Design a protein around this ligand. Structure first.
Ligand SMILES: Cc1cc2nc3c(=O)[nH]c(=O)nc-3n(C[C@H](O)[C@H](O)[C@H](O)COP(=O)(O)O)c2cc1C
Ligand code: SF4
Ligand code: SF4
Ligand code: SF4
Ligand code: FES
Ligand code: FES
Ligand SMILES: [K+]
Lengths: 432, 263, 214, 44
């Protein structure tokens, strides 16, 4: 068999079945859809069995880095010393174009809470701190209420699910910072400091929050793990190509008729995703210009690549981009493609933490140059200068925010160079 | 039996566990360029000037922070190492003010000297530069903070050596500033020592302001008599006049600090 | 404000009066007990935000107080206060309007939403009306991209806006009403407009699809 | 009665300035005793 075509996920194979909040999000409704079912049996299997299901499912981090979750969660499966261990759920979701983690929190809070317990059990963690951006004040409150219902029901807290395992789930609100979504910068924010990433090593599995073994995992990665244990790793691994398994939450925004969050199979064609769910590109497929396929951090691709690209980690890598958060942004032919990307570099210049030189000075530099390419106020040689600057930033910074400031620039220079050189021509003839 | 073997430019050197890539290079006499790293402060790893290539690894590592692993071959002069330094120096100098003639650091400036040895010889920055407010932290240390390179040495020293948590960073991104936020004087018996660790003219000696240049001073190694510690000092003279007092390193006595009364 | 240095003024100085109300001391105690003993500093962000919720903005005397309660050096609270953007170091209006203008919202005409507010209120971006009832600023992505263009006022999201809808929302706020948050177009959340393409079947109850051995 | 037509997450239209921090105070009785580093703070 090995279905070589993907998509058309059936409503019975969807995990986040309350994505649209048309069913009750509280505990009573959640249990009616499968949540908190046989959780005691899962916990009594143990961490080795749980980590077995995560590995077999081929689940990969949904936070944008896309690492193998099963291998990542296994660094915490080591004998303890004097320190406690923690699970940090990353609910920051600051990436432009991304809004999937918001839905999970306010429409399926109990899936996240059960993921924390199951995931925390696998890693030997004594508690889970859920870090949710400060702007999501109503979504955090919903989660805080669901946390109360779980406490009162014996599902978490002392003797969680009756399994003799003690677990805590804390909610901590951010205070406004896209950089706190970075795993180490999140930890420093929980500890009460500025959200500035740490250098690695040490790795959070060895030295994390409060100086203790920690694993930082995305909201979506945690939220699906209990289902993978109930339904098995093999079921999850039955979707998508090889090394690209599972369902995936997609946001489709920008210039589509029906912007929407939606669940769909991994490795579905990008066109099929946009057309069937989002209602097509505004003004028809032939009005398409370029798509940012995974939030601002990833390079944009043109209409030619968009014809036959699949939405998975490896298919987009060979397109010179990345799946990222899978936040598809569509830009139609009326968009000022230079001005769209200039506003992204302005976003990064506003988010850089300032800690390390290449991004503190470089991204601010690329912002000034892009501001001029929008007006055409430059000469063509500055395009290759901007390319070189972006390479001096990439791979030289402390964290990946620097890399994600460069890739938008490299995408624009890679595919729309004539657009840049064309706009420089007009400014010259007008002023000379 | 615990020492592991690593290579610097192919040359074997036996180091103990926990030694960083920067410290293993010192053992073969190679000094890696640095700004934020200071051997008596906590590692920071933010300036990025110590980036070095490791053979068979696609990504440069920070030499001041990275622990060295067994069998690594540190390429301190490869093209990737040299392009890393060139790029980092370009970012440091992009917003730095053209102050060298009026800046007291001139002639003994690590930003100047490492730009000559590891940086490019020209600029491709065509924008307008950043400018920063000047702070008032007391009558001993003059601040010209547009020259600051955000190495955070002064913050770390004040916290860890001086035991004063009054220096920090306010703001974010490019306009991240070093200071006290409020109008506070960094009055401390050891406060003058932030003039020396500061690798640029951002912090300079207010009493010393404008009087001399480093190349014209004669260095006399002597001792301090303001107290009984006997800190080792250097007396800087120029044409028969005493110009300033500097620390002289002595591990067993004052390390590389002196008190404000000695200075 | 725009500057990350504090100059004392008659309205914002260390002697400016601030203090938590006794209920807020109960709230702090619960906050601090969320972290290991010996790591009270982890409460700086929540407790500092509790000062802003009680007072509306963070005067220098509020940060000085949070330093006393948590026993962290004041400079470490000034660092936190100026790093994060949700903290107000200058007084704002009663309703703080925050229009998102990053690319996904920009692509869907977030500009017109911004022009309507300015015409509707008579101020430019970043200003405070003479009423002291409205403050306007652009912000970065707010995590509601698929519902662009959107604004946040205080703690609530008003989504799928148009120039008409935002003018109505201010009309209510001026009138003293409490406008309902959420999209203003016709849909309720993030589902596609004009119908659903997924989650149309009733979900499967507990026990479904569970592998053997459980 | 299976109604896939009406929005149901409507509790958040009444949340207030202290909704989040009131709940955190309300959960305080359920939590386990926090671990200790052995010292009152890093500066001790
Ligand atoms: C600037 C920056 C912002 C990030 N923001 C998020 C985020 O909002 N949510 C998230 O899950 N991961 C974010 N990440 C990725 C995290 O660092 C980390 O990879 C993730 O939390 C791991 O989750 P996962 O393994 O479950 O995918 C960000 C990374 C960077 C560099
Ligand atoms: S790359 Fe940017 S955000 Fe990341 S640590 Fe360096 S300065 Fe901070
Ligand atoms: S700090 Fe160094 S490079 Fe900068 S102006 Fe002074 S002497 Fe010149
Ligand atoms: S003032 Fe000097 S020591 Fe302090 S951060 Fe700036 S350059 Fe470094
Ligand atoms: S000396 Fe290593 S980054 Fe500064
Ligand atoms: S771009 Fe405005 S909410 Fe994301
Ligand atoms: K100096």
């Amino acid at each position: 068999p090995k279905k070589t075509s993907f998509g058309s996920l059936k409503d019975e194979d969807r995990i986040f079945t309350n994505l649209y909040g048309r069913h009750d999000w509280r505990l009573k409704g959640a249990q009616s859809r499968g949540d908190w079912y046989k959780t005691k049996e899962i916990l009594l299997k143990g961490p080795d069995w749980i980590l077995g299901e995560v590995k077999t499912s081929g689940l990969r981090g949904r936070g944008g880095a896309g690492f193998p979750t099963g291998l990542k969660w296994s660094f915490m499966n080591k004998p303890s010393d004097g320190r406690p261990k923690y699970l940090v759920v990353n609910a920051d979701e600051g990436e432009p174009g991304t809004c999937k983690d918001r839905e999970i929190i306010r429409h399926d809070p109990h899936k996240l809470v059960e993921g924390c317990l199951v995931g925390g059990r696998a890693m030997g963690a004594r508690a889970a701190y859920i870090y949710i951006r400060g702007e999501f004040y109503n979504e955090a409150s919903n989660l805080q209420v669901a946390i109360r219902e779980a406490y009162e029901a014996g599902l978490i807290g002392k003797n969680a699910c009756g399994s003799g395992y003690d677990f805590d789930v804390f909610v901590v609100r951010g205070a406004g910072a896209y950089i706190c979504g970075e795993e180490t910068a999140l930890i420093e924010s929980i500890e009460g400091k500025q959200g500035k990433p740490r250098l690695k090593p040490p790795f959070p599995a060895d030295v994390g929050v409060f100086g203790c073994p920690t694993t930082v995992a995305n909201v979506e990665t945690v939220a699906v793990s209990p289902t993978i244990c109930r339904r098995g790793g093999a079921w999850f691994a039955s979707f998508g190509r090889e090394r690209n398994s599972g369902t995936k939450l997609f946001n489709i925004s920008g210039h589509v008729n029906n912007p929407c969050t939606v669940e769909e199979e991994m490795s579905v064609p990008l066109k099929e995703l946009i057309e069937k769910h989002a209602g097509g590109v505004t003004g028809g497929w032939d009005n398409l210009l370029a798509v940012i396929p995974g939030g601002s951090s990833t390079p944009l691709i043109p209409k030619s690549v968009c014809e036959t690209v699949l939405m998975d980690f490896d298919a987009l890598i060979q397109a010179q981009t990345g799946l990222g958060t899978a936040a598809v942004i569509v830009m139609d032919r009326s968009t000022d493609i230079v001005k769209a990307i200039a506003r992204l570099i302005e976003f990064y210049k506003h988010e850089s933490c300032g800690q390390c030189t290449p991004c503190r000075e470089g991204v601010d530099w690329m912002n000034k140059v892009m501001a001029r390419f929008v007006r055409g106020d430059a000469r063509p040689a500055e395009i290759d200068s901007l390319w070189e600057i972006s390479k001096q930033i990439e791979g030289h910074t402390i964290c990946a925010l620097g890399d994600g400031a460069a890739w938008p620039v490299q995408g624009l220079i890679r595919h729309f160079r004539p657009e840049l050189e064309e706009r420089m021509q007009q400014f010259a003839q007008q002023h000379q | 039996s615990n020492l592991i073997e690593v290579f610097v430019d192919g040359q074997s050197v036996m180091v103990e566990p926990g030694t960083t890539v920067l410290q293993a290079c010192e053992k073969v006499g190679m000094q890696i360029p640095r700004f934020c790293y200071h051997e008596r402060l906590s590692v920071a790893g933010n300036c990025r000037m110590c980036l070095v290539e490791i053979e068979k690894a696609p990504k440069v590592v920070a030499a001041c922070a990275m622990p060295v692993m067994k069998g690594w071959n540190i390429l301190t002069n490869s093209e990737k190492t040299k392009k890393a330094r060139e790029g980092v120096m370009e970012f440091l100098l992009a917003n730095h003010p053209l102050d060298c003639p009026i800046c007291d650091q001139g002639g003994e400036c690590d930003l100047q000297d490492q730009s000559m040895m590891f940086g490019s010889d020209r600029s491709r920055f065509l924008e307008g530069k950043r400018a920063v407010e000047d702070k008032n932290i007391g009558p001993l240390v003059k601040t010209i903070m547009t020259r600051c390179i955000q190495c955070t040495r002064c913050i770390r020293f004040a916290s860890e050596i001086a035991g004063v948590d009054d220096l920090g960073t306010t703001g974010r991104g490019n306009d991240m500033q070093v200071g006290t936020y409020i109008e506070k004087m960094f009055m401390s018996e050891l406060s003058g020592n932030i003039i020396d660790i500061c690798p640029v003219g951002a912090l300079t000696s207010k009493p010393y302001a404008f009087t001399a240049r480093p190349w014209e001073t004669r260095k006399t190694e002597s001792i301090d008599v303001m107290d009984a510690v006997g800190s080792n000092i250097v007396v800087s003279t120029r044409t028969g006049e005493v110009m300033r007092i500097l620390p002289r390193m002595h591990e067993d006595i004052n390390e590389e600090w002196i008190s404000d009364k000695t200075r | 404000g725009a500057l990350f240095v504090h100059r004392d003024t008659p309205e914002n100085n260390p002697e400016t009066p601030f203090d938590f109300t006794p209920e807020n001391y109960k709230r702090i105690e619960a906050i601090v007990k969320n972290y290991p003993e010996g790591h009270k500093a982890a409460a700086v962000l929540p407790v500092l935000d509790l000062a802003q919720r009680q007072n509306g903005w963070l005067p220098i005397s509020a940060m000085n107080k949070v330093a006393e309660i948590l026993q962290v050096p004041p400079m470490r609270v000034y660092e936190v206060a100026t790093f994060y953007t949700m903290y107000n170091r200058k007084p704002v209006g009663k309703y703080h309007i925050q229009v998102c203008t990053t690319t996904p919202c920009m692509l869907r005409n977030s500009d017109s939403i911004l022009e309507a507010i300015q015409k509707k209120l008579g101020i430019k971006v970043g200003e405070t009306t003479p009423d002291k009832l409205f403050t306007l600023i652009e912000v970065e992505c707010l995590g509601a991209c698929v519902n662009a263009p959107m604004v946040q006022i205080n703690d609530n999201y008003y989504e799928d806006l148009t120039p008409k809808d935002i003018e109505e929302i201010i009309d209510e706020l001026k009138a003293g009403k409490i406008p309902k948050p959420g999209p203003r177009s016709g849909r309720f959340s993030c589902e596609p407009a004009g119908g659903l393409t997924s989650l149309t079947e009733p979900p499967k109850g507990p026990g479904f699809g569970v592998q053997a051995g459980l | 009665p299976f109604d896939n037509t009406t929005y149901k997450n409507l509790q958040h239209h009444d949340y207030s300035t202290y909704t989040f921090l009131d709940l955190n105070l309300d959960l305080s009785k359920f939590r386990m005793p926090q671990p200790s580093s052995g010292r009152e703070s890093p500066r001790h």
